[PDB]
Amino acid sequence: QGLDLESARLASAARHNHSANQTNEALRRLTQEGVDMERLRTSLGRYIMSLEPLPPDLRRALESVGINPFIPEELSLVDHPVLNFSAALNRMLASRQTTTN
Numbered sequence: 730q731g732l733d734l735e736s737a738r739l740a741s742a743a744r745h746n747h748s749a750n751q752t753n754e755a756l757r758r759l760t761q762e763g764v765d766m767e768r769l770r771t772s773l774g775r776y777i778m779s780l781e782p783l784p785p786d787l788r789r790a791l792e793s794v795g796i797n798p799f800i801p802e803e804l805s806l807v808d809h810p811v812l813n814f815s816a817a818l819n820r821m822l823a824s825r826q827t828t829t830n
Contacts, residue, residue, distance in 0.1 A: 752817045755794040764790050773815045
């Protein structure tokens, strides 16, 4: 006896695991995956604004790390995890090259 396996497995199904590591992890993973940092920064910045969306390449890459690109406009693209992703992205590349004028 001891059939209480539902209660045990749902707690493990939920789990606690997340960090700002996942942001920098996504950046470096997409780099190793075959997505260029600059092209990523373009398609991502476009997604933030009223512009052309990111390709299913950028989509599959992000979703494979666990960061969903396509958030509905009920969040108004504010509450989405893709902001913190884009933040670390643009400031990383800005620090790499430069921000002149």
